[PDB]
Ligand binder design. Structure first.
Ligand SMILES: Nc1nccc2ccccc12
Length: 168
């Protein structure tokens, strides 16, 4: 149904809300939720752990089956797997992990994966355990994504800083 509500329109195609992405998925019934994935699709932490728990581990079971046959993703890459109870599809996108020395330039590649989907519910890529500057990630999103992205930011303080930064 893609019933997004209460988002702040930043650009013609980028929207943001102070919300929990899992509760958004339940409310919106998006066609596509983006996962903040790693290359092995091991969803023990970060947004990936939240999404996987909300699928009662179905996302991890599917992901383990996928990796054993298909091999890992690349940093900056993506795959499309089931959305389970959260969405029709899950776009698993690997942003660079700058806490582990990966090149922040790959954040552009990461966001380019969104352009194959008309509308997405997504987290800010490379945030949290991936260590990138969230203000920078929002700029790369706005500069790179051409399709309609609805960003959910959990932490109110961080939301407020992102919106302030963007309106400067
Ligand atoms: N659950 C959730 N939703 C949106 C953004 C997040 C960022 C980090 C952890 C959880 C998040």
């Amino acid at each position: 149904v893609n019933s997004f509500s209460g988002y702040l329109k930043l650009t013609d195609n980028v929207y943001i809300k102070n919300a929990d992405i899992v509760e958004e998925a339940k409310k919106v019934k998006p066609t596509v939720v983006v996962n903040a994935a790693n290359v092995y699709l091991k969803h023990g932490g970060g947004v990936a752990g939240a999404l996987n728990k909300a699928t009662n581990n179905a996302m991890q079971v599917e992901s383990d089956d996928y990796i054993a046959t298909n091999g890992p993703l690349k940093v900056g890459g993506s795959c499309v797997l089931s959305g389970h109870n959260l969405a029709k599809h899950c776009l698993h996108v690997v942003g660079p992990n700058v806490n582990k020395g990966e090149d922040i330039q790959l954040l552009k590649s990461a966001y380019e994966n969104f352009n194959q989907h008309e509308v997405l519910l997504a987290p800010l890529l490379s945030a949290g355990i991936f260590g990138a500057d969230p203000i920078h990630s929002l700029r790369v999103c706005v500069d790179t994504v051409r399709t309609n992205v609805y960003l959910a930011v959990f932490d109110k303080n961080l939301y407020d800083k992102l919106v302030s930064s963007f309106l400067e």
